[model samples]
Target chain A: QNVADVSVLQKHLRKLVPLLLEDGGEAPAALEAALEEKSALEQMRKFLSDPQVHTVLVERSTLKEFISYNINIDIHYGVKSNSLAFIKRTPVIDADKPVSSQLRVLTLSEDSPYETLHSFISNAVAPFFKSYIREKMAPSVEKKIAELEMGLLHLQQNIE
Target chain B: NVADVSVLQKHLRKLVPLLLEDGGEAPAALEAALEEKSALEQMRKFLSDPQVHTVLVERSTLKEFISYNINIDIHYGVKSNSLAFIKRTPVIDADKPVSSQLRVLTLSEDSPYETLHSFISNAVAPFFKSYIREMAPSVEKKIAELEMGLLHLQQNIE
Candidate 1:
């Protein structure tokens, strides 16, 4: 019953929604909706400290945990049904059905919570957002942007 | 001290031919040196049970007493300016001192005693029957160590 501040928990859940929504939010709205639940928030509060579950959520998710939050998502979900529920809470949304194949593909390799914290910080956030706007979320995009810069004609000729 | 059946001088006198016989070189020296069968029997009797010196003989010295003898050719001599080699029948040099006497070849793997007894019994005694008294008992301590190593490390031996 005793848990972290509900507001903060809710805020953290809200924070992840934009992330799930980023690459065309295919997670059934039902799945996304449970993020608002008190039970889910309680779980997240425990996840913040519980090393075993915390690592599953973030740090060392090598086994079943490493699958969803880190490795390929859909296949991991389909495989480790029991552990997936506690970690991803996918079943909370539509216990009756599974997420679609296309949606699974879209979410397959989304950054793990731990990895997102690590790699993003290691590459950019540690550099203080100043140098980051130049870096693309994906390297291919960065390459394309560089190409665009190369193609641009005299910028002085353009008035704002 | 005046030589009244002096045990020390008597035993020492008995060893003269052996010591003078070019280090137990010939069967004649063993034959002459071991003339007093009763005395050798007495020495063997005194040595039958394990004692401190016997422990030293077996453990530190690698000596053992075997019930058999071997004959071979070897040159056992001592110098009185020139070396004196007591010779035996050249025809039956079978258990000749030069060839068959126990000599230490290798060390026992376990206790120094194991090596000592093995050295004496397996390696040293064949030619010198007299060693049967001086070196056998000393092997006990080394044997204990050897047996412990062999028994406990049994699985590891292969």
Candidate 2:
């Protein structure tokens, strides 16, 4: 089952890379190669570890689309296995999170809320990705514009 | 486009389980409809069930659900003495993805057996996921793929 899931996920990523490359300039070569490499997770880890790779840029729109697809594929795959998730959705994920395990109540386990989980997929995950994308993609060109405009106006006044 | 008789029979052969998986009991009329060798008869049985009728009727809109691509030859004909029979063939749409037409025509209104089909297909053939999900009304994944294809094609064309 995991193998099938792996194949499915791999297929999604393979189709996705072309779209990413189309939208953004070429990303690091290692990142592309890592997808095909055996021990892909470790190879991806290798790619992420490299400081030289940081100099490259890929389109954020492409990355966002990738994430959107992943979240959905996660759900589509999730729904099939959503009925019996061997791994549970834990209430606590972060350190400064909702509650400490000590404060958490112990209760009978229930089925994953597939729609709510999907809603989380729809609502919980996407905007933050876009927020980061817009911010990082944003150059301080407006700030640059203001500085240039002020200098021009000051120069005109000085000559007059 | 009318499927070739050979191809139609192939789809029909594949569709046998999808229609017949309902052992939980439909009315005798529905039972025979399920039992019929004739695709028209199977649909005729479904057409009578209000549950099936309403859902299929509701889905008759053109775009979101591609309705009536196939010329359903099921209308009453006048025989001078009285109205006679429907000879309409389900015309698969030429434009919409042909697979959807197959899937939609394979769209059975009965839900109980849908689970059975959904389960068995997943277990034995694994082909049913794609086939049967669309078999359920307004399933998203395949439709999403098709819609995105159109959207992408539109974006590219523009």
TM-score versus the correct structure, for each prediction: 0.18, 0.19
The 10 consecutive residues of candidate 2 chain A with the worst lDDT sum are A100-109
Clash totals in order: 28, 11
- Candidate 2's displacement at residue B148, Å, is 31
Docking class of 2: incorrect
RMSD of 2: 24.4
Q: CA shift at A107, candidate 1, in angstroms?
A: 8.0
TM-score of chain B of 2: 0.22
Model 2 per-residue lDDT tens digits across residues A1-160? 0112233333333433332222223433533554454565443232223322211111112231232111110111222221110111121122232111101100001112222222221221122122222441122322322332333334334435
Evaluate model 2 with DockQ and give the value.
0.01
Estimate the Cα RMSD of every predicted model relative to the unseen true structure. 43.4, 24.4
